[PDB]
Amino acid sequence: PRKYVFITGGVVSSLGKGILTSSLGALLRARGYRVTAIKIDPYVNVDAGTMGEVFVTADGAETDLDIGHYERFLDMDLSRGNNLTTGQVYLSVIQKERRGEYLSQTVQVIPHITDEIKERIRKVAEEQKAEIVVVEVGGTVGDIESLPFLEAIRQFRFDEGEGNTLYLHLTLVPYLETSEEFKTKPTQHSVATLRGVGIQPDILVLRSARPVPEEVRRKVALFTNVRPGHVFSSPTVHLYEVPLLLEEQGLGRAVERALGLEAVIPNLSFWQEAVRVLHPERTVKIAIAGKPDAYLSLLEALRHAGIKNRARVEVKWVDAAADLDEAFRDVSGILVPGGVRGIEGKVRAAQYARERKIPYLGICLGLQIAVIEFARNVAGLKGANSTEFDPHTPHPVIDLMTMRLGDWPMRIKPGTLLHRLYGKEEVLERHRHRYEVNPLYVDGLERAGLVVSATTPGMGAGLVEAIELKDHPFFLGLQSHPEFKSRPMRPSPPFVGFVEAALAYQ
Amino acid sequence: PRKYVFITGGVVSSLGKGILTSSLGALLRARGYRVTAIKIDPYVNVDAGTMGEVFVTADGAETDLDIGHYERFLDMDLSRGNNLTTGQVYLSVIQKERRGEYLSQTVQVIPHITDEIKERIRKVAEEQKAEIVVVEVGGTVGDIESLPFLEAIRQFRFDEGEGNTLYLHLTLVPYLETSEEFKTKPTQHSVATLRGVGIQPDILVLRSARPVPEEVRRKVALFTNVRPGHVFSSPTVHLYEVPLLLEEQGLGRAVERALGLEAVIPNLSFWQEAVRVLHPERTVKIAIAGKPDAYLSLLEALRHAGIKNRARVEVKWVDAAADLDEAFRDVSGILVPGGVRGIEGKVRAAQYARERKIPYLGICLGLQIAVIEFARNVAGLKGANSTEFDPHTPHPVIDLMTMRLGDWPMRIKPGTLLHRLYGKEEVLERHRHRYEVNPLYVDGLERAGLVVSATTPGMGAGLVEAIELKDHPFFLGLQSHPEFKSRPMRPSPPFVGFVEAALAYQ
Amino acid sequence: PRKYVFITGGVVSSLGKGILTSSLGALLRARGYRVTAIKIDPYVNVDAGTMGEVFVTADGAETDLDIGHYERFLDMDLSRGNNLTTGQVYLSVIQKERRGEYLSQTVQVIPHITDEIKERIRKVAEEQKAEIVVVEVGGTVGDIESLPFLEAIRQFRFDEGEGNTLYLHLTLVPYLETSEEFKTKPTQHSVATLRGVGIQPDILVLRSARPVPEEVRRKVALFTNVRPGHVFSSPTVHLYEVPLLLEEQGLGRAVERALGLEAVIPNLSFWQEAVRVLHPERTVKIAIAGKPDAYLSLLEALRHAGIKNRARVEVKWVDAAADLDEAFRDVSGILVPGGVRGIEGKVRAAQYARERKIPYLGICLGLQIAVIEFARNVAGLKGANSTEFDPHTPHPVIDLMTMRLGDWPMRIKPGTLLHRLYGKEEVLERHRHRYEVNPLYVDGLERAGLVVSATTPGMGAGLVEAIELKDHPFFLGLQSHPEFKSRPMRPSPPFVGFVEAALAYQ
Amino acid sequence: PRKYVFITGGVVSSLGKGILTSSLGALLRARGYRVTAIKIDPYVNVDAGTMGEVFVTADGAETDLDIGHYERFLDMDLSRGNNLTTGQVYLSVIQKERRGEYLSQTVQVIPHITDEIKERIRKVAEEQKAEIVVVEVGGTVGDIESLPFLEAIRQFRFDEGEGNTLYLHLTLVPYLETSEEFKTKPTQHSVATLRGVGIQPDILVLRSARPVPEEVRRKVALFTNVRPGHVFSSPTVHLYEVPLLLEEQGLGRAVERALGLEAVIPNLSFWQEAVRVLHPERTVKIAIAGKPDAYLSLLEALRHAGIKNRARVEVKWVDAAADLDEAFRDVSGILVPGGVRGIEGKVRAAQYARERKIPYLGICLGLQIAVIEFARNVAGLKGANSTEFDPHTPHPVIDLMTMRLGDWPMRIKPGTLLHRLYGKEEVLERHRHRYEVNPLYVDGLERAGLVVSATTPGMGAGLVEAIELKDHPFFLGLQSHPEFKSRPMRPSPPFVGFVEAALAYQ
């Protein structure tokens, strides 16, 4: 029987519910279960494409960044089905009643919208063969946008039967220094609101400025009709330790028993060894061309890399005149991420990284920038540009034709720098872009020394996917967003390679 | 400054809020104000077309039947803009965010859905030049489907300023015979729920099995923070007296003062004279071919007619073997309404009404039935039928090509029975049908004695709009639904004529 | 393990929750369980003495009339402990904190007031050796006066463990004739309010103008998270059939299983036979001197009597010039109940009943009235009166010294009319009065023919308890309220005797 | 017309509502209004005597410490009537219904308890001739203990009419460093709960870890239906500046206009000059014999004193072997406060302060300790003690006979050290103690050099009120708690004198 663990938030948002969901899911995987995670975003937006970073799943769905957390903690490919919104649900039901599919019935929030919500939850869990599905409800309990979702998950208790559903609630326990006292009132009120929509939480996670004492934890239990052993503290601490400490506190065992599952000692060797590496062995500083959650998967990628290279990575944020030497001193690498509203400054950094032999990695726009840079100062195409930043450029080396989305096959040219990192001839990488290297200028660029180490069969295409130079210690650029597939258990090669050269340059 | 009177319902629905809205609006018109009414239906259906009768406005919108009440009490043409639903609102906002119109913003119920709601209310009121707009909120206060609408109307207090908004709340006051006591608790709780969403009602209307005593009314006032003079009883009583009694109780004056309007004695002569006629002068019984709210506008039309002919009309519901003579004894007229799932029985009644010279009126399907009937037993086209009830008939006198919606121009053929009733050459009537008289069979039908007293220039067309026979005392059929435009101040001619002949046949 | 069944009410009061509580308790006794009932009255009054009738328990407590229902259905003596009020609870806790018993703690509603509430519930159940205790919460769910009590009973689920508590909720399902439809919305909202204070009802009882259809019952179940088999109808029907029909519907079995009790066919022979007698065999009409719930136990007593005498009793309410003959024609008995504000009219009826040999029974004041009457027109003590209605009377045959409360021993004088009815020499009867027969006038009254068939040893006393006359077919008066101990399984003798003579007089 | 400003708290308690109430009241006094403050404590305790410090008013009432804040900010004597509790209210109403004062009525929370609450508020305001009364509701909005009080203050809007009541609500706006963002959700929810009990706050005060930005303040306004100009920040900052900054923000003007009062520039010279002194001119450190809110009035007294002596006072908390010299180095004074559970250690400090000529001040127990000390090592009465700490002492110099409460007249012996400080012959000081100097030992103590500089005429007495020694630079002890009357506008002499000598000893 499939088990469902619902996680809601109260008092205030931003208390790390995404990580909580991710960590609980990992704790369940470490017990040998087939797990999946679903993020419910109560906003009216159909998806996150009109929008913090927008994560992209293999199927091309644009989603909330929590999906990326879930993928990294579960080491699992998710899909559009794992990110539910108010817009999707309402649009879906509305179009159905327009097609008369409800057979002249009067469609209401309950049960029509709620039925749609539960159906989507079950559908994705099915397709993903999940034994335990962790569903995180976005927003804060109380706001009206979450009501249809709260009623939907509440109904699961009856639908699934005894022992197959569990409700966790994350809340804030303010700490007042003046009085030096913890306040449990907000938690009490939030739980009362939950009960008001018909839900009694089984487990409570408390987040506070300081770790929550058992005395305070026992108080919260007494006033929320929650067993003391089911109240936990969620202190501020390397995100990789989160699942470790939660397991140590008993959250794993708690969820396990409440779900009617025979206890299974969890294998947390990976996470332990991961945090182990996280005193390192070395420490290199790389520069990122740009002006936090906007680069979450990017930063995580550098993290994974640092680990594979038993080395800590510091990140200096360079915001791109010729006053670079300083901005780039004490740095062993330059990374131009995907993007915007001004590109010459980066075109400058690419130029610099290229002539000073500083490890370089351009993602999406970062690749197009190196190409614009190469074309100008090497291929001799003055004013070369992307039609995105100059529609009238005489040399549109980057032109048209978020269009390419999700996984796209990339064919790696043998014996290239790109081939060394992947060690394979073909791989899939996720896309989200509308501009590409102009086919017409590809001949001339290679004649000048620009290497096209990757292209796509299409899906559909035949476009350039990666560029490099046989000539600097490390100069690579890819059109896709390799960070999106990067996982702590499997770092993205471009970043592993980039970090390596940064260590060699050190 | 435009005034807004919002009317909500509590405890239970079906207490006559539509009539309350209509009556208040009429009381305001009798004071010389430009008024309009808006019905908010919280269901997810975009409109009422996938669905009680479905009213059709002049612009072709399919709406809740309350619109028809508003049109009849206000003697005013309304539009799709006067019937707001959850589907419309959400679909509208969703499509806007898909077109990026929200400029990368995160769309939420508040303020995006609520802004859309208020915008639609103001838009329609503008186009209709309303000085006072009465907005009725469907559903019952408390259910979650109404929350976005309750928050939207609540915001009007602040947006419109002091003296420009008023909130009325209709509730049920159960009466327990055993104890012989009135119960005000439900009202108290409902008002508390309203306050919970931020609304304090200014006026309360109490509906009970028996009229509500001032003692009970004064109690409700004490426990709802509502002035005693602002608590009224809504007893069961001819619907036309409703506005009269409400005015007599002081509801008119109350609304007037709360809105900051100098008192104006209302001119209720029409309604008074209307109820005056409603001991009549005569009394004819007509038969309606069919199996209540499903024929609301139909029945109202007969009501208006009876009034124009200073005569009361009884309605025997005939559900169509040759055992008609009985079913049609003591009756002076036969009416076949628009429709379905079986038509031969009506084809029989048309046949009967035709050979026994019994006043006949067919609406929509009722016209097509007389044509099928004529074609068979007069034009000699055995098995003649509409392709709607027999796609394989050898003589599809009624075929294809709710397609035609709203007002369509009808050209009345001079000196016909149809011309006598309308006394004009051209008029507009509202449509809602997909089947029409087949052009190919029109020649042969007239040669047999069937008169085409009306057709349409199109919009688009050239189709038959009305049929009759120079030969029986009254035999008429129209493709449109003339009942939809019928108002107590202006009865629909086809029904006025139909009732007349019924009196002559008497 | 002791089981607790809590019964709450929603929407409106007065739906017969007292009878529901009584009936459920009887259904449980018919299964061989030791049962007790507790009435919680949320008003601030300490008890019902400052106040519908005020019932008096054997220990002298003045309580709500529901206690009398419980005693009659359970055939059980209850005590002050079975009627809990807000005043008692708060006064109790307040006096405790004044005596520092809370050890310098800050006393709050929760847990101090709530602890007091649960403690009183358990205390009484203990003393009464109850296996299943039915607790009825007065008032309507939602009002703030019941909050401390709702929180207290809610806590019992956790305190008592799984299978030992059950929550029943009685609500109103309005019926609208116009629409001819049942409304379940109020029930839905009331249940939502219950959930808001943390309670999910296990069983729902629906009360409506007409019996509630399974269709409506199944709807309520769907929208209240209550199993369909746990939703019952509480129709209007002889109160003695109530437990019968509730058992037939499955309420007995339902409660049984939810409490984890092996099913036990109930023995409902008594109730069946009782309703059996209730087409009678005869039918006598008696008159009650007075101007409904005010005489509940009185009327029940006549009911019990009628049953013992296989005869139906009609009650003509006589409100006491010499125009009695009419007021007392077609009547075979006169009863002057306890009381007031005017007594001469009754003094007249006593006079009449005495000279016309009409069976007479005076309770409390009714006895004192016969004595005033005898003293005047037989003992020749002009102006004889009670100092309660004439402090200056020259012959205070009734004087001072609700003072005597509860059970008081009565010694029946052998071979008297009072001895024939009780067939015993000594019994206990419940009191509630301050005025007594004046000792000084007792000698002279007997010399005139007034028989003192009962007195009290005291407790404390030596006062007259009953009077009669060897001379009329039946003339009896008691100082106590024998109706209070009258039970359908054991009618009160004075009433059994009174009804008998009424049959003989017939 | 009397104005009422109600102040409630939400989200969590302890945000400084007492100071807020005090500060607003002072801002109103600085405008020339007659003001008073009332503290409502929802706990069930009748008063604070069974209990943070317990403040004592002139009439002998034992109250919450907020009363002391109000007295200090308003420079006004308050009474038991200014501290309302749930116990008082319920006990009061209960005793009234027991005396039948409600005339057989059924007493309920509403309106009986609520009527009692409003009556007490108005009664005290009357007796205190208040033009504007500031009422602070203890507890947090939402908890059920405050419901009767919230309903009572809500009713004032209707009772007092337009422009005479204003509602202020203090809430917490958590600040999350990780996100570096302010959270307004809790405020939104708390305001929604207030609206749920029928109250819409007119003004909001926001308390956060960091001052609240106008951006956040404007957001809160948008989501609480509160004008932006009526939203203020309550930052952490000398408590005397509080009223200054609140006035600078516009809170004074805001309250003024909402109350319909013509603006009046406030005279805040005192508070300004007070904070002016608070960089001082000097700085002495005194020791307090003991182990925070427990000594609030005590500490405030030292504060007032420091001000009168243009000097800052540091407080070293000495917890009383002969290892004093250290514990008392760098200190210029010793203060033994009222109290307990162990006194020898203090007896030691008194001894030390006496032989080393260190300014000493004993309050209540502090005086009795100096007497026990004197009697032993000067009067030669070995084992001398108070029967409170040794019922068997052979020399009970302190014995019996919180008994003496509130203001008691003290007669100052001319030309004494006690006379120099007060400069008057007679004054009133507040008491709260049961033990007194034993009359029998007074002769012998003076013969040994102990000076009785004060006694009481009684009320009732003739007991010692103060002791000193002509011989050390400053050695004083009083039986009363002079700190209770100490106000920043009028420091308590004993403390002014004590601080002076501490400066001289410096």
Q: What is the spatial distance between Cα B278 and Cα B310, in angstroms, rounded to a whole number?
A: 8
Name the residue among D42, D94, D145 with its Cβ closest to that of C87.
D94
SS (HEC) of D33-85: CCEEEEEEECCCCCCCCCCCCCEECCCCCEECCHHHHHHHHHCCCCCHHHEEE
Residue A70 Rama label (left phi>0; alpha psi -120 to 50; beta): alpha
- Is any Cβ of chain A less than 8 angstroms from the Cβ of B51? yes
User: What's the length of chain A?
Assistant: 506
Q: How many CB atoms lie within 10 A of CB B103?
A: 7
Residue A6 host element (H or E): strand A3-9
Q: Is A357 annotated as a binding residue?
A: no
Q: Is A53 annotated as a binding residue?
A: no
Q: What is the spatial distance between Cα D67 and Cα D151, in angstroms, rounded to a whole number?
A: 23
Cβ-based contacts of D42 with chain C (< 8 Å)? 108
Contact (CB<8Å) B144/A145: no
Q: What is the spatial distance between Cα B383 and Cα B345, in angstroms, rounded to a whole number?
A: 14
Task: Tell whether D69 and D182 lie within a shared domain.
Answer: yes
Task: Tell whether C311 and C450 lie within a shared domain.
Answer: yes
How near does any CA of chain B get to the CA of D196, in Å? 4
Q: How many CB atoms lie within 10 A of CB B109?
A: 21
For the beta sheet containing A203-207, the strands, ordered from the edge strand earlier in sequence to the opposite edge, are: A83-85, A35-41, A132-137, A3-9, A165-172, A203-207, A231-233
Task: Tell whether B298 and B315 lie within a shared domain.
Answer: yes
Cβ-based contacts of A195 with chain C (< 8 Å)? 195-196, 198
Contact of A479 with A433, CB cutoff 8 Å = yes
Q: How many CB atoms lie within 10 A of CB D68?
A: 26
Cβ-based contacts of B183 with chain C (< 8 Å)? 12-14
Contact (CB<8Å) D172/A172: no
Q: Please, which residues have CB within 8 angstroms of residue A482's CB and are 6 or more apart in sequence?
A: A301, A363, A429, A430, A492, A493, A494, A495
Q: Is D129 annotated as a binding residue?
A: no
Examine the fold and report which residue of B258, B279, B300 is the final residue of a domain before the chain moves on: B279
Alpha helices by DSSP H, B204-282:
214-222, 242-249, 251-258, 269-277
Contact of B412 with B425, CB cutoff 8 Å = yes
Query: Nearest residue of D to residue A208 by CA position?
Result: D176
Cβ-based contacts of B45 with chain A (< 8 Å)? 97, 106-107
Report the SS3 class of residue C361: strand
Q: What is the spatial distance between Cα D224 and Cα D202, in angstroms, rounded to a whole number?
A: 10
Name the residue among B46, B97, B145 with its Cβ closest to that of A109.
B145
In order of A155, A195, B415, C155, C265, the CA distances from C437 in angstroms are 69, 61, 103, 51, 52
Task: Tell whether B341 and B393 lie within a shared domain.
Answer: yes
Task: Tell whether C258 and C303 lie within a shared domain.
Answer: no
Which residues sit opposite D165 in a β-bridge?
D4
Contact (CB<8Å) C94/D113: no
Name the residue among B192, B196, B198 with its Cβ closest to that of D225.
B198
Q: A438-470 burial string, b = 16+ CB within 10 Å, else e?
A: beebbeebeeeebbbbbbbeeeeeebbbbbbbe
C304 is catalytic: no
Given the DSSP bridges, would you call strands D396-400 and D435-437 parallel, antiparallel or unpaired?
antiparallel
Contact (CB<8Å) D225/B192: no
Q: What is the spatial distance between Cα D359 and Cα D344, in angstroms, rounded to a whole number?
A: 20
Q: Is A13 annotated as a binding residue?
A: yes
Structure determination method: X-ray
Q: How many CB atoms lie within 10 A of CB D427?
A: 18
Q: How many CB atoms lie within 10 A of CB B254?
A: 20
CATH number at residue A490: 3.40.50.880
Its sign, for the CA torsion C31, C35, C41, C45, is: positive
Count of the separate structural domains present in chain A: 2
- Is any Cβ of chain A less than 8 angstroms from the Cβ of B59? no
Which chains, if any, share at least 3 CB pairs under 8 A with chain C? A, B, D
Name the token pair of C172: 């109103």
Say what angle helices A269-277 and A242-249 make with each other, to 10 degrees: 130
Of C384, C322, C371, nearest to C349 (Cα)? Answer: C322
In order of C301, C316, C361, C504, the CA distances from C332 in angstroms are 17, 11, 12, 9
Type of residue found at B382? K
Cβ-based contacts of A142 with chain D (< 8 Å)? 185, 189, 192
Contact of A127 with A4, CB cutoff 8 Å = no
Name the token pair of B425: 């050459």
Q: Please, which residues have CB within 8 angstroms of residue A326's CB and are 6 or more apart in sequence?
A: none
For the beta sheet containing D451-455, the strands, ordered from the edge strand earlier in sequence to the opposite edge, are: D311-318, D282-289, D334-336, D360-363, D475-478, D464-468, D451-455, D404-412, D426-433
Type of residue found at B20? L
Name the token pair of C331: 């009547």
Name the token pair of A397: 């080396």
Type of residue found at B16? G
Report the SS3 class of residue D171: strand
Of C26, C21, C41, C32, nearest to C134 (Cα)? Answer: C21
Type of residue found at D31? R
Contact of B304 with B491, CB cutoff 8 Å = yes
Cβ-based contacts of B173 with chain C (< 8 Å)? none
Residue A296 host element (H or E): helix A296-308
Q: What is the spatial distance between Cα A421 and Cα A398, in angstroms, rounded to a whole number?
A: 25
Cβ-based contacts of C292 with chain B (< 8 Å)? none
Q: Is C448 exposed, middle or buried (0-12, 13-18, 19+ CB in 10 A)?
A: middle
Of C305, C334, C332, nearest to C319 (Cα)? Answer: C334
Say what angle helices A86-98 and A114-127 make with each other, to 10 degrees: 110
- Is any Cβ of chain B less than 8 angstroms from the Cβ of A47? no
Name the token pair of B255: 């609304």
Examine the fold and report which residue of A244, A279, A314 is the final residue of a domain before the chain moves on: A279
List the 364-383 stretch of C: residues with Cβ below 8 A of D: none
Task: Tell whether C124 and C109 lie within a shared domain.
Answer: yes
Contact (CB<8Å) D196/B195: yes
Please give the backbone phi and psi of residue D468, each rounded to the nearest 5 degrees, phi first.
-160, -175
In order of A144, A172, A194, D34, the CA distances from A140 in angstroms are 9, 11, 10, 45
Of B209, B275, B210, nearest to B248 (Cα)? Answer: B275
Task: Tell whether D387 and D268 lie within a shared domain.
Answer: no
Task: Tell whether A265 and A346 lie within a shared domain.
Answer: no
Q: What is the spatial distance between Cα D411 and Cα D427, in angstroms, rounded to a whole number?
A: 7
Q: What is the spatial distance between Cα A361 and Cα A337, in angstroms, rounded to a whole number?
A: 8
List the 151-180 stretch of A: residues with Cβ below 8 A of C: 158
List the 96-155 stretch of A: residues with Cβ below 8 A of B: 97-98, 100, 102, 104, 106-110, 112-113, 144-145, 147-148, 151
Contact of C110 with D144, CB cutoff 8 Å = yes
Tell me: cis bond preceding D280? Omega within 30 of 0 counts.
no
Given the DSSP bridges, would you call strands C181-182 and D282-289 parallel, antiparallel or unpaired?
unpaired
Question: What range defines the domain where residue A267 resides?
Answer: 1-279
Kindly list the catalytic residues of A. Answer: 364, 481, 483
Task: Tell whether C324 and C234 lie within a shared domain.
Answer: no
- Is any Cβ of chain A less than 8 angstroms from the Cβ of C196? yes
- Is any Cβ of chain B less than 8 angstroms from the Cβ of D198? yes
E strand residue ranges, A177-230:
181-182, 203-207
Q: What is the spatial distance between Cα A104 and Cα A89, in angstroms, rounded to a whole number?
A: 20
> CA-CA-CA-CA torsion for C377, C383, C386, C389, nearest 10 degrees?
120
Task: Tell whether B83 and B180 lie within a shared domain.
Answer: yes
Q: List the Cα angle B149/B151/B156 in 5-degree steps.
A: 100
Q: Is B387 exposed, middle or buried (0-12, 13-18, 19+ CB in 10 A)?
A: middle
Task: Tell whether D102 and D229 lie within a shared domain.
Answer: yes
Q: What is the spatial distance between Cα B435 and Cα B479, in angstroms, rounded to a whole number?
A: 9
C481 is catalytic: yes
Q: List the Cα angle D163/D14/A225 in 5-degree steps.
A: 105
In order of A63, C268, C491, D367, the CA distances from C271 in angstroms are 67, 6, 14, 79
Name the residue among D172, D181, D189 with its Cβ closest to that of A14.
D181
Contact of C203 with C246, CB cutoff 8 Å = no
Contact (CB<8Å) A178/D142: no
Q: What is the spatial distance between Cα B393 and Cα B383, in angstroms, rounded to a whole number?
A: 6
Q: What is the spatial distance between Cα C134 and Cα C166, in angstroms, rounded to a whole number?
A: 10
Name the residue among A46, A113, A144 with its Cβ closest to that of B98.
A46
E strand residue ranges, D208-299:
231-233, 282-289
User: What's the length of chain C?
Assistant: 506
- Is any Cβ of chain B less than 8 angstroms from the Cβ of C280? no
Name the token pair of D397: 């110099």
Q: What is the spatial distance between Cα D208 and Cα D217, in angstroms, rounded to a whole number?
A: 11
Q: What is the spatial distance between Cα B209 and Cα B212, in angstroms, rounded to a whole number?
A: 9
Contact of A438 with A396, CB cutoff 8 Å = yes
Q: Is D424 annotated as a binding residue?
A: no
How near does any CA of chain D get to the CA of B155, in Å? 9
Contact (CB<8Å) C178/B13: no
For the beta sheet containing D35-41, the strands, ordered from the edge strand earlier in sequence to the opposite edge, are: D83-85, D35-41, D132-137, D3-9, D165-172, D203-207, D231-233
Residue D364 Rama label (left phi>0; alpha psi -120 to 50; beta): left
- Is any Cβ of chain B less than 8 angstroms from the Cβ of A192? no
Of A57, A78, A63, A70, nearest to A26 (Cα)? Answer: A70
Q: What is the spatial distance between Cα D350 and Cα D366, in angstroms, rounded to a whole number?
A: 9
In a mutagenesis test of the D interface, which of A179, A181, A185, A188 is the best target, namely the one with the most D β-carbons within 10 Å?
A185
Contact of B7 with B135, CB cutoff 8 Å = yes
Q: What is the spatial distance between Cα B135 and Cα C185, in angstroms, rounded to a whole number?
A: 23
Cβ-based contacts of B43 with chain A (< 8 Å)? 106-108
Residue A383 Rama label (left phi>0; alpha psi -120 to 50; beta): left
Examine the fold and report which residue of A279, A295, A313 is the final residue of a domain before the chain moves on: A279
How near does any CA of chain B get to the CA of D192, in Å? 7
Task: Tell whether B389 and B467 lie within a shared domain.
Answer: yes
How near does any CA of chain B get to the CA of D147, in Å? 14
Of A202, A110, A193, A121, nearest to A160 (Cα)? Answer: A121
Q: Which string of DSSP letters, residue by residue, matches C396-410?
A: EEEEE---EEEEEEE
How near does any CA of chain D get to the CA of A146, in Å? 14
Residue D176 host element (H or E): strand D175-176
Contact of B492 with B301, CB cutoff 8 Å = yes
E strand residue ranges, B298-389:
311-318, 334-336, 360-363, 385-386
Q: What is the spatial distance between Cα A114 and Cα A284, in angstroms, rounded to a whole number?
A: 51
Q: Please, which residues have CB within 8 angstroms of residue A427's CB and are 6 or more apart in sequence?
A: A409, A410, A412
Alpha helices by DSSP H, A398-481:
417-422, 442-447
In order of A306, B235, C348, the CA distances from B21 in angstroms are 70, 15, 61
Contact (CB<8Å) C225/A198: yes
CATH number at residue C57: 3.40.50.300
Name the residue among D12, D15, D143 with its Cβ closest to that of A186.
D12
Count of A–C CB contacts within 8 Å? 16
Name the token pair of A412: 């790696």
Q: What is the spatial distance between Cα B163 and Cα B167, in angstroms, rounded to a whole number?
A: 11
Resolution reading in Å: 2.2
The catalytic position among C304, C364, C468, C500 is C364
Of A144, A95, A107, nearest to B113 (Cα)? Answer: A144
Report the SS3 class of residue C133: strand
Please give the backbone phi and psi of residue C409, each rounded to the nearest 5 degrees, phi first.
-70, 135
Cβ-based contacts of C193 with chain B (< 8 Å)? 189
**CA contacts within 13 A on the Cβ side of D277:** 20
For the beta sheet containing C404-412, the strands, ordered from the edge strand earlier in sequence to the opposite edge, are: C311-318, C282-289, C334-336, C360-363, C475-478, C464-468, C451-455, C404-412, C426-433
Kindly list the catalytic residues of D. Answer: 364, 481, 483
